[PDB]
Design an enzyme around this catalytic site. Structure first.
Site, PDB file in Angstrom:
ATOM      1  N   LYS A 130      -3.461  40.172 103.556  1.00  0.00           N
ATOM      2  CA  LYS A 130      -2.226  39.389 103.439  1.00  0.00           C
ATOM      3  C   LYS A 130      -1.284  40.058 102.436  1.00  0.00           C
ATOM      4  O   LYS A 130      -1.757  40.512 101.410  1.00  0.00           O
ATOM      5  CB  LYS A 130      -2.562  37.958 102.956  1.00  0.00           C
ATOM      6  CG  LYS A 130      -1.370  37.096 102.605  1.00  0.00           C
ATOM      7  CD  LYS A 130      -0.661  36.469 103.791  1.00  0.00           C
ATOM      8  CE  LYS A 130       0.720  36.034 103.386  1.00  0.00           C
ATOM      9  NZ  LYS A 130       1.796  35.724 104.407  1.00  0.00           N
ATOM     10  N   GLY A 159       4.196  43.172 117.434  1.00  0.00           N
ATOM     11  CA  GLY A 159       5.137  42.208 118.010  1.00  0.00           C
ATOM     12  C   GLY A 159       4.800  41.995 119.458  1.00  0.00           C
ATOM     13  O   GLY A 159       4.905  42.915 120.303  1.00  0.00           O
ATOM     14  N   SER A 186       8.425  39.668 111.829  1.00  0.00           N
ATOM     15  CA  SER A 186       9.000  38.545 112.674  1.00  0.00           C
ATOM     16  C   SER A 186      10.521  38.602 112.783  1.00  0.00           C
ATOM     17  O   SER A 186      11.234  39.198 111.947  1.00  0.00           O
ATOM     18  CB  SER A 186       8.430  37.198 112.208  1.00  0.00           C
ATOM     19  OG  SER A 186       8.676  37.018 110.896  1.00  0.00           O
ATOM     20  N   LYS A 226       6.335  48.180 106.179  1.00  0.00           N
ATOM     21  CA  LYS A 226       6.513  47.212 107.209  1.00  0.00           C
ATOM     22  C   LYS A 226       7.994  46.796 107.259  1.00  0.00           C
ATOM     23  O   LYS A 226       8.572  46.375 106.247  1.00  0.00           O
ATOM     24  CB  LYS A 226       5.592  46.029 106.935  1.00  0.00           C
ATOM     25  CG  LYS A 226       5.714  44.859 107.864  1.00  0.00           C
ATOM     26  CD  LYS A 226       4.908  45.118 109.124  1.00  0.00           C
ATOM     27  CE  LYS A 226       4.919  43.894 110.029  1.00  0.00           C
ATOM     28  NZ  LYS A 226       4.002  42.849 109.528  1.00  0.00           N
ATOM     29  N   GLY A 266       5.387  36.649 118.764  1.00  0.00           N
ATOM     30  CA  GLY A 266       4.829  36.408 120.080  1.00  0.00           C
ATOM     31  C   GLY A 266       5.684  36.871 121.218  1.00  0.00           C
ATOM     32  O   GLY A 266       6.355  37.906 121.105  1.00  0.00           O
ATOM     33  N   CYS A 271      11.254  41.538 101.672  1.00  0.00           N
ATOM     34  CA  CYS A 271      10.927  40.895 100.415  1.00  0.00           C
ATOM     35  C   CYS A 271      12.247  40.554  99.784  1.00  0.00           C
ATOM     36  O   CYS A 271      13.276  41.054 100.214  1.00  0.00           O
ATOM     37  CB  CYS A 271      10.105  41.803  99.501  1.00  0.00           C
ATOM     38  SG  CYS A 271      10.699  43.514  99.425  1.00  0.00           S
ATOM     39  N   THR A 289       0.582  36.730 116.239  1.00  0.00           N
ATOM     40  CA  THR A 289       0.499  35.394 116.924  1.00  0.00           C
ATOM     41  C   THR A 289      -0.676  35.269 117.873  1.00  0.00           C
ATOM     42  O   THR A 289      -1.347  34.240 117.856  1.00  0.00           O
ATOM     43  CB  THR A 289       1.806  35.141 117.697  1.00  0.00           C
ATOM     44  OG1 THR A 289       2.875  35.186 116.720  1.00  0.00           O
ATOM     45  CG2 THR A 289       1.755  33.833 118.428  1.00  0.00           C
ATOM     46  N   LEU A 325       4.856  33.099 101.699  1.00  0.00           N
ATOM     47  CA  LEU A 325       3.936  34.032 101.131  1.00  0.00           C
ATOM     48  C   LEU A 325       2.767  33.443 100.306  1.00  0.00           C
ATOM     49  O   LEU A 325       2.484  33.822  99.110  1.00  0.00           O
ATOM     50  CB  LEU A 325       4.728  35.073 100.326  1.00  0.00           C
ATOM     51  CG  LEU A 325       3.863  36.291 100.053  1.00  0.00           C
ATOM     52  CD1 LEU A 325       3.840  37.231 101.271  1.00  0.00           C
ATOM     53  CD2 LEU A 325       4.477  37.045  98.918  1.00  0.00           C
ATOM     54  N   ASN A 350      15.636  39.927  97.599  1.00  0.00           N
ATOM     55  CA  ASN A 350      16.566  40.867  97.050  1.00  0.00           C
ATOM     56  C   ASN A 350      17.356  40.129  95.941  1.00  0.00           C
ATOM     57  O   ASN A 350      17.006  38.976  95.557  1.00  0.00           O
ATOM     58  CB  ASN A 350      17.491  41.278  98.166  1.00  0.00           C
ATOM     59  CG  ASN A 350      18.103  42.664  98.008  1.00  0.00           C
ATOM     60  OD1 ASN A 350      18.772  43.125  98.922  1.00  0.00           O
ATOM     61  ND2 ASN A 350      17.969  43.289  96.860  1.00  0.00           N
TER      62      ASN A 350
HETATM   63  C1  LIG Z   1       1.450  32.934 109.830  1.00  0.00           C
HETATM   64  C2  LIG Z   1       2.105  34.302 109.658  1.00  0.00           C
HETATM   65  C3  LIG Z   1       2.028  34.988 108.435  1.00  0.00           C
HETATM   66  C4  LIG Z   1       2.577  36.261 108.265  1.00  0.00           C
HETATM   67  N1  LIG Z   1       2.619  36.873 107.059  1.00  0.00           N
HETATM   68  C5  LIG Z   1       3.005  38.177 106.980  1.00  0.00           C
HETATM   69  C6  LIG Z   1       2.837  38.919 105.702  1.00  0.00           C
HETATM   70  O1  LIG Z   1       2.299  38.269 104.736  1.00  0.00           O
HETATM   71  N2  LIG Z   1       3.307  40.126 105.681  1.00  0.00           N
HETATM   72  C7  LIG Z   1       3.884  40.723 106.735  1.00  0.00           C
HETATM   73  O2  LIG Z   1       4.192  41.921 106.671  1.00  0.00           O
HETATM   74  N3  LIG Z   1       4.079  40.097 107.937  1.00  0.00           N
HETATM   75  C8  LIG Z   1       3.630  38.848 108.060  1.00  0.00           C
HETATM   76  N4  LIG Z   1       3.750  38.180 109.260  1.00  0.00           N
HETATM   77  C9  LIG Z   1       4.395  38.900 110.333  1.00  0.00           C
HETATM   78  C10 LIG Z   1       3.356  39.530 111.257  1.00  0.00           C
HETATM   79  O3  LIG Z   1       2.601  40.558 110.581  1.00  0.00           O
HETATM   80  C11 LIG Z   1       4.003  40.120 112.507  1.00  0.00           C
HETATM   81  O4  LIG Z   1       4.835  41.264 112.062  1.00  0.00           O
HETATM   82  C12 LIG Z   1       4.819  39.137 113.345  1.00  0.00           C
HETATM   83  O5  LIG Z   1       4.086  37.917 113.535  1.00  0.00           O
HETATM   84  C13 LIG Z   1       5.125  39.682 114.754  1.00  0.00           C
HETATM   85  O6  LIG Z   1       3.924  40.000 115.438  1.00  0.00           O
HETATM   86  P1  LIG Z   1       3.354  39.020 116.601  1.00  0.00           P
HETATM   87  O7  LIG Z   1       4.403  38.992 117.629  1.00  0.00           O
HETATM   88  O8  LIG Z   1       2.125  39.617 117.057  1.00  0.00           O
HETATM   89  O9  LIG Z   1       3.225  37.730 115.947  1.00  0.00           O
HETATM   90  C14 LIG Z   1       3.193  36.918 109.409  1.00  0.00           C
HETATM   91  C15 LIG Z   1       3.182  36.278 110.631  1.00  0.00           C
HETATM   92  C16 LIG Z   1       2.660  35.022 110.801  1.00  0.00           C
HETATM   93  C17 LIG Z   1       2.777  34.360 112.147  1.00  0.00           C
HETATM   94  C1  LIG Z   2       9.963  32.838  97.770  1.00  0.00           C
HETATM   95  O1  LIG Z   2       9.342  32.691  99.065  1.00  0.00           O
HETATM   96  C2  LIG Z   2       9.007  33.845  99.777  1.00  0.00           C
HETATM   97  C3  LIG Z   2       8.925  33.782 101.170  1.00  0.00           C
HETATM   98  C4  LIG Z   2       8.576  34.970 101.938  1.00  0.00           C
HETATM   99  C5  LIG Z   2       8.281  36.152 101.302  1.00  0.00           C
HETATM  100  C6  LIG Z   2       7.947  37.359 101.982  1.00  0.00           C
HETATM  101  C7  LIG Z   2       7.764  37.551 103.465  1.00  0.00           C
HETATM  102  C8  LIG Z   2       6.324  37.152 103.773  1.00  0.00           C
HETATM  103  C9  LIG Z   2       6.304  36.955 105.232  1.00  0.00           C
HETATM  104  C10 LIG Z   2       6.110  35.722 105.774  1.00  0.00           C
HETATM  105  C11 LIG Z   2       5.844  34.531 105.003  1.00  0.00           C
HETATM  106  O2  LIG Z   2       4.791  34.486 104.332  1.00  0.00           O
HETATM  107  O3  LIG Z   2       6.585  33.557 105.182  1.00  0.00           O
HETATM  108  N1  LIG Z   2       6.127  35.496 107.210  1.00  0.00           N
HETATM  109  C12 LIG Z   2       6.389  36.512 108.108  1.00  0.00           C
HETATM  110  O4  LIG Z   2       6.530  36.276 109.329  1.00  0.00           O
HETATM  111  N2  LIG Z   2       6.619  37.738 107.540  1.00  0.00           N
HETATM  112  C13 LIG Z   2       6.519  37.996 106.141  1.00  0.00           C
HETATM  113  O5  LIG Z   2       6.689  39.182 105.867  1.00  0.00           O
HETATM  114  C14 LIG Z   2       7.735  38.498 101.226  1.00  0.00           C
HETATM  115  C15 LIG Z   2       7.824  38.559  99.820  1.00  0.00           C
HETATM  116  C16 LIG Z   2       8.153  37.358  99.191  1.00  0.00           C
HETATM  117  C17 LIG Z   2       8.416  36.202  99.887  1.00  0.00           C
HETATM  118  C18 LIG Z   2       8.720  35.051  99.154  1.00  0.00           C
END
Ligand SMILES: Cc1cc2nc3c(=O)[nH]c(=O)nc-3n(C[C@H](O)[C@H](O)[C@H](O)COP(=O)(O)O)c2cc1C
Ligand SMILES: COc1ccc2c(CCc3c(C(=O)O)[nH]c(=O)[nH]c3=O)cccc2c1
Ligand SMILES: Cc1cc2nc3c(=O)[nH]c(=O)nc-3n(C[C@H](O)[C@H](O)[C@H](O)COP(=O)(O)O)c2cc1C
Ligand SMILES: COc1ccc2c(CCc3c(C(=O)O)[nH]c(=O)[nH]c3=O)cccc2c1
Lengths: 313, 313
Positions: free
Chosen positions: B44, B250, B196, B165, B223, B131, B273, B72, B133
């Protein structure tokens, strides 16, 4: 129970219309849309000079939506202006005329000439900002300074209420900035959200090939792919532009999809890919489906639920 | 026939792994991913301190995909570092550790600590550039000057090969800009496309409500909604970054979806997803389905068709 709306000093039997670019390029198309049960129609986004557009294939559809890089094929502004001034029957329904010049000067030239027709016949202008400007720069609505410039110059040149067709945004800071730019211009009375989700890529597994010819297969996405994106943008602008109308466009295939747009804040609701695929029959179906949903919920008018999407706690 | 591959000086049994954020938050999750048939796993995205994340409901899935605003939630960098250092079995598969600090300073501090563990154990770093800014600006990857700063600072602090990423882009000028930034940094050896699709909105017609609680129901889409977006970004980066690897993420639900990512240029394919919905069993199905497509086409290796999507004329 009724679907009637009155807005922009016009009356609309229902909120449904074509999305620019679909079923609206030729006099035949425009007469077809006019004969349909849509509440309005919009003419194909035009340029000063006619355009043949990009090489084919340049549109393809699939179960989940469509991809296109049409290259703005159109009959030229003079044709759409003539249609507006001389051919359209306004007793049937209102007309929008979309323009999409390739420079700010080209837009100004067209709106100057549109204005007297707008004032006399009541055609409504939709300016397409989800459009190229200088190659290697972002499309106009992704370049906030260019966007401001286009709106200042068109506001000055046109002098009358108009609306703008916006690309989707994906970041809250962009929602904020884009709405603040729009809110500088009081003649911008409606905002259409959204144009296609830009530069997607569809690949056919059997042939191992892209499906459209231009741009190595990259093109704008419409249809079921984009509904949540479209609802987000409708709602984001609905919340940020309280003195403007929002028109929803993206992913409408059913009265339920229309209902969601309207809950998000949509006044009019535009149909692109689903119309391209199903034909203008779709409008009777959409009306029937939306009225069935209203009847089950006890809603008699659109204003009872427009923009009333609930949030959680 | 087997899907084994070598990259970044590691060997992988197949190109599949979880997407960051899915099935990778806790020791239990990481052990489950490790026991699966995936070729690798990613932890994560973490911050220096642990986080609870956003109020629930914060994730929801539907037939066409998912929406999330997790906030996060994570166990903190110390936990994932300890996992990488002491708990992960590297004889089972490679491990990627995702970092997503709230500032450049926080990221630099985490990467300085990770570097010796990357050296000793071979854990790979994925820097998440979605992340936050500075005030008023979009996420870091959408602000190219901030992205350049982050990569300079991380490259100096870490000093070893790493990946990034990326969020999706929608504009060809943006692809050009973003790729040129990444191409300034020789230590950036892989690019993962995509995170996403930002700030979509899912509304339930029956309840007339949004479906997640944070941000008035706005959140990232994954998804089926995003596969064409994902393929475009994979391919755009594959074309523009010849000296790097591209990892696709994706919209993967089938070996066919994975096949399309690889054709577009993907070296590894991440599952988000569909993994969250189907569970870790999905990896054996995906491997079988991709091999079955290869067999029918006569392909014996991934290298034979990676990046070989055909264009028209
Ligand atoms: C519940 C959830 C949590 C996620 N948390 C992260 C994360 O912590 N860091 C990150 O780079 N992407 C995060 N993502 C994005 C996924 O890694 C992915 O890039 C995105 O879901 C698109 O792929 P999919 O179509 O297979 O879902 C998260 C996605 C989901 C659904
Ligand atoms: C202050 O709240 C946040 C929310 C999302 C955050 C994120 C994005 C984490 C993330 C999330 C998320 O955990 O919501 N979901 C995704 O689909 N992609 C992601 O990359 C990165 C660093 C700090 C963050 C702080
Ligand atoms: C073939 C085609 C041509 C289009 N041309 C235009 C155009 O000329 N101007 C415009 O504003 N939008 C244009 N669009 C975008 C549509 O108006 C609409 O914003 C987009 O397709 C999303 O709606 P949908 O999901 O109903 O397709 C076009 C779309 C398609 C599919
Ligand atoms: C190569 O010339 C053009 C002209 C207009 C374009 C536009 C604007 C016209 C347009 C088109 C289109 O004509 O390609 N398609 C859409 O889905 N929405 C639109 O607004 C978008 C993308 C590429 C374009 C290329």
């Amino acid at each position: 129970m009724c679907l009637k709306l009155n807005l922009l000093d016009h009356v609309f039997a229902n909120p449904f219309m074509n999305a620019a670019g679909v079923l609206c390029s030729t006099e035949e198309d425009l007469r077809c849309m006019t004969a349909s049960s849509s509440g309005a129609l919009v003419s194909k986004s035009c340029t000063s000079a006619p355009r043949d557009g990009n090489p084919e294939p340049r549109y393809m559809a699939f179960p989940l939506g469509s991809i296109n890089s049409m290259g703005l094929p159109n009959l030229g502004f003079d044709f759409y202006l003539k249609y507006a001034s001389d051919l359209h029957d306004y007793s049937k329904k209102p007309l929008f005329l979309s323009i999409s010049g390739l420079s700010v000067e080209e837009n100004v030239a067209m709106v100057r000439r549109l204005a007297p027709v707008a004032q006399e016949k009541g055609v409504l202008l939709e300016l397409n900002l989800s459009c190229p400007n200088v190659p290697g720069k972002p499309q106009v609505a992704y370049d906030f300074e260019a966007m401001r410039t286009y709106l200042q110059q068109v506001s000055l040149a046109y002098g009358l209420p108009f609306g703008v067709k916006m690309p989707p945004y994906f970041d809250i800071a962009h929602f904020d900035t884009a709405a603040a730019v729009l809110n500088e211009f009081p003649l911008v009375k409606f905002v259409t959200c959204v144009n296609s989700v830009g530069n997607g890529l569809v690949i056919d597994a059997e042939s191992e090939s892209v499906v459209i010819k231009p741009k190595q297969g990259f093109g704008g996405l419409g249809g079921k792919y984009i509904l949540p994106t479209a609802l987000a943008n409708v709602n984001a602008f609905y919340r940020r532009c309280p003195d403007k109308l929002v028109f929803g466009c993206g992913g409408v295939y059913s009265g339920e999809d229309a209902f969601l747009h309207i809950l998000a804040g949509a006044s009019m609701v535009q149909v692109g890919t689903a119309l391209q695929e199903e034909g203008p029959g779709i409008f009777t179906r959409l009306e029937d489906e939306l009225l069935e949903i209203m009847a089950r919920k006890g809603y008699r008018t659109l204003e009872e639920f427009r923009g009333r999407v609930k949030t959680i706690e």
